[PDB]
Design a protein around this ligand. Structure first.
Ligand SMILES: [Cl-]
Ligand SMILES: [Cl-]
Ligand SMILES: [Cl-]
Ligand SMILES: [Cl-]
Ligand SMILES: [Cl-]
Ligand SMILES: [Cl-]
Ligand SMILES: [Zn+2]
Ligand SMILES: [Zn+2]
Ligand SMILES: [Zn+2]
Ligand SMILES: [Zn+2]
Ligand SMILES: [Zn+2]
Ligand SMILES: [Zn+2]
Ligand SMILES: [Zn+2]
Ligand SMILES: [Zn+2]
Ligand SMILES: [Zn+2]
Ligand SMILES: [Zn+2]
Ligand SMILES: [Zn+2]
Ligand SMILES: [Zn+2]
Lengths: 258, 257, 257, 256, 257, 256
């Protein structure tokens, strides 16, 4: 059935799109991770997938089934992998998954992929998956496969937007786990999966300039959040979404011209 | 408030695991061609839909499904040479299963059902289970129990088979994108099926061995191993009934409250 | 001369592959418990005997067999909890098949038959074949052909099944250390079988799912899934000729001179 | 000596026998650093910082990892450059894992990993997690690890302004810039020829990455920022700031 | 009554292991070219022959041998460029040894003798042992002991060496398909040897370094590194008794009741 | 400088641009060497030999590998000694493999691997094979590798009689003995305290190995033979013989 999601297409519909010779494919990469007492744990898959869908509808791309499990949650950016519910993969597993998928897409005749990450710690493993796959493609005689990797939040860098989102100053994505940014998007996209009343208020989380292992539960706010989402809103969610969708769409048109 | 783990907050999940008798379910599928008439995420949709109903019926939680599975085999899945089909190497599937089990044990969970919806996944899901349990044993854990199954194995009653194929069954090794799955999809996701696109062809026959590289000439052009022309919502509802009931009973038997 | 590669000098082997259409055969077995009446190397002995005879009949050569195979499954071979059974992890068996194919391709060989004698080996043998062919492709080789088979799949004639099981045939999984293998052993290695130790118990019945860790209480104590009481040298010789004939014909078809 | 490689096994054994010995492991890379610096800067710098920290707190420094993870365009220029010799992530993770396993066997239980190569981080972390998982299966849960990239200890605004009068722009476009070149000028003056620096505006990248890496998107010299204003004085400043801060972090994480 | 684990039922193996002090022996060889006069499974045949005799004298059990070994190196086996030679990657061999030790420990065995018959295998067997022992420690097992040995290292007595090479020994480096092995073969498997085919060329001379890719011209065309012209059944029986006696005593020493 | 780590990528690129440049990679280990020597001996010696050889033939030396494969009892004392820090075989193999892959990406096609740790051999060899296999898949078949253990070049009876009057015995029993100790005295005199040598008779082992390692089977000092008769003079003889032998071998295998 006609859709922007590859999973909803028959192989003939998929084949027809790739036969175009310039088809863009998008792959959401998330995680199953705790997101405080106010949001569900599949946030990292829901948000990038929602972004991909909208971008795909505007530029005419297709969206691959997203990767539901990501790399281990880090303390200073995701709370820590000691919370229950958070289910993480080892680095080699996530890399191997990205690598196999690129190898397969190349077999289909696809040559354009956008990897949209929604989980802070996935980046380097996604990157190693790309490198290893491109290496194999070369051995197979393929050097025209192009890949763009990005975390959708990096497109929200406009001062005017930042001020709107954070009237009291932005302290970097360093502590934006389950905070204003993600809660806003969820309020605008999946309100039934958020209960702002369960939001535990507390000052931003601050850590020294180093990490300790084993992780020290005490150095992470009990709720699992690194900053309060008390000021999150549907309107903020709407602004962030249009900003990301438009930025990413224009980025793709630039990198993958017809 | 659903049965999906991904839709709970960690506090809600922790509370469930806290009962000490909580049962977790994990669908393992694949992105694979399913003829001209069906979408490619059938192997994820069906076991996920079965897990949801079983979980609702017995009080279990459902983990996010594995969207990508093992390579497609010709004598059961047409072959991994079709476009769209996106398969992982066996080591990657095994490692994914193994990692998930390790994490569940860490949560304190000790009961897991793995519901496969893609033929070739089985042995790789099994190696994952074995490697994870060996690992849990090294960590001093030996009370984690796992039940693994392919939902179609629960459709054995002849009376049932009689109604689905009132002409003769030929085995789950000829039913790729045929009456069985198509009927389930018509009952569960009619918008993802278009019976008017079905390529009605005779059943495909294979010798008692496999050839590599896969020879495309030995698979029906549409990718199906048999015709889904006689598929229907009613057959789908019959199958669903049977699967949910049988699997639900099996879990009550293996994981008593 | 001999059909076993191991018993040839490199010069003879080289001359054989130099013909450009030489067929090679590799038996893949296992060291697994086979009840109170049979030895544990059955899974290697049988496929090797079949390859030997098939190879001699059609002019192929046989590679040293793989003595260790994948983990024994409960509903297939009793379970990997038994003493004696010595299994490899999936990646290990896969890597072995993959390395051997790579080497054969280096020799100039382009035709291989993998004959499995242990139920659970299949998928790992398949993954080994796939990863090998992927590599050969990177090396610019796409003319290497492989045929994988389990020798018991050629015994599918109702007339033969009837002569073997008048009372009825349940399947290949429940045939662990039963009439089939014991009959072949009586005709091939009678000194390694003792019918007097056979435990004549009813056929093992299993639910449509697997439980892990394996529960010993669910597998017949002797390790067999069905009685080999009615086994015989006569049945064994019938099985052997059907298997050798069928496999030799398949090879001649897949690998014409 | 504070370096393990310069001790006999008996001297090393005696030190760890104290029961509270802290070991340090520099993790660098062989990577291009512009026309003005040699390629082993990522090894030299953390090793120099470790040596000085160890001398002040009584720790030991392990031989440094000479090879690190693949250089990334937006933070290191890209792995398409000559000279840069990178390991696959699994190779680096495994090396870190093996070393931690061996140290646990010696009886050591305190390790500080000082990274000097940006992209090494996530792979050093995985190496730590896999090793600790192993140590747990072995019945060891008292092995503690502190991991850090020495440049993160330079966060005091007073210091930043003295290093960057015009302003600062994150440790991304720093590759081969002021920070590193200034340290080399103070520690290894003969391995840096500032006269060969190629002045150019700080590299700007869009909020995404492209593979295969496009050579045209990295400044020709391989630097992401100009080292023109780097100096020995800035070097001495950075050095003392990092040595003191890290020495104190270690005292708190690993009290005697 | 046999000493081969493969020829026992699982109940027989279980009794021997449960009896305690059971010593298992595992031959590790290779499929490798051995000149114009010998077959290619020599490296499996010899250590297996030695294990058999030792096990019969000391009451040990011998496991199915590893048929494929590590890549052949020029300065010791001619080079992995010859046809017939079928080598495994190091990790595959290491993993196979690790898996078997893990399983023997599960059976309850705690004593193992790895008898190597292929020069290049040694370090990969060692890593296998180490990775396996590390794993056993995680499992709480620290009383599993392993002895690894190349059977030729037991032929050290000057007297014996004089009777074998009256012209002067020259180390095992240049001893491939030469007098030592060809003699053991004449005494154990004369059928697989044909001295008439021996190429009496002088010992191979190599520089103190190795080159890759291997240069074919630096290895004697026959594949042997020394002539086996002076090999004899007599020499074979001498070496055999020497190795058997030495290995037997060594085992009694390392594995006391 | 002959050290790649000391060159800028521009310098390195120019040298490789010649199209006949020879690279050399020292492969060592962090391993106990008795009571009289430091533990980085296996890295220091091959690196020292490479430096001298490279200066004579105009080659370049890559950063050496600091950690090698596990120490074996009958040749290195045993991996049970404190201080010895070994990698698993897969890790060392992967390291060699990755480096070769990168040198190929550079355009280099000539590599000399100089092993200074007895137990590294087979894993270095497997790394090379895996690398060449992969290079073949990339359409590259003109990459040539020479592997060697520097001690294999001291084969002249005249040199041996001169080094071991009372008789030689074999590299397997040489761990921390006269050979390595003499080289250290001539090259790194500050890292060796001959006065700490334990003068015990050569070690004797049966023709087999036992695992787990039995500590009682290794001389207590960790040495397999006495270095009491080691000297700076002997070291200079060894060094010149090795340097000249390797230099000439490299000329024959990698002709100008
Ligand atoms: Cl996050
Ligand atoms: Cl299917
Ligand atoms: Cl079976
Ligand atoms: Cl950097
Ligand atoms: Cl040999
Ligand atoms: Cl040594
Ligand atoms: Zn999130
Ligand atoms: Zn996240
Ligand atoms: Zn399906
Ligand atoms: Zn499927
Ligand atoms: Zn069997
Ligand atoms: Zn079996
Ligand atoms: Zn740097
Ligand atoms: Zn760097
Ligand atoms: Zn041999
Ligand atoms: Zn050999
Ligand atoms: Zn040494
Ligand atoms: Zn050493």
């Amino acid at each position: 059935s006609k859709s922007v999601f590859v999973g909803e297409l028959t192989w003939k519909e998929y084949e027809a799109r790739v036969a175009a010779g310039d088809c863009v494919l998008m792959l959401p990469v998330g995680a199953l991770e705790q997101h405080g007492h106010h949001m569900c744990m599949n946030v990292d898959v829901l948000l990038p997938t929602a972004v991909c869908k909208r971008v795909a509808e505007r530029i005419g791309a297709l969206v691959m089934p997203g990767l539901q499990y990501g790399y281990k949650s880090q303390q200073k950016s995701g709370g820590g992998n000691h919370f229950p519910g958070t289910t993480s993969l080892d680095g080699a597993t996530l890399t191997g998954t990205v690598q196999d998928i690129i190898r397969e897409l190349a077999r289909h005749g696809a040559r354009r992929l956008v990897l949209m990450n929604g989980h802070y710690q996935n980046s380097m493993f996604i990157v190693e998956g790309i490198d290893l796959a491109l290496r194999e493609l070369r051995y197979a005689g393929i050097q025209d496969f192009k890949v763009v990797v990005l975390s959708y939040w990096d497109f929200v860098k406009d001062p005017a937007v930042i001020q709107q989102l954070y009237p009291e100053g932005f302290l970097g994505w360093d502590i934006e786990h389950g905070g204003v940014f993600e809660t806003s998007l969820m309020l605008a996209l999946y309100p039934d999966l958020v209960d702002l009343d369960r939001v535990v208020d507390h000052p931003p989380a601050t850590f020294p300039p180093y990490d300790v292992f084993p992780v020290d539960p005490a150095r992470t706010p009990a709720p699992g959040t690194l900053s309060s989402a008390k000021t999150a809103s549907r309107e903020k969610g709407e602004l962030i979404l249009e900003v990301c969708v438009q930025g990413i769409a224009d980025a793709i048109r630039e990198e993958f011209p017809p």
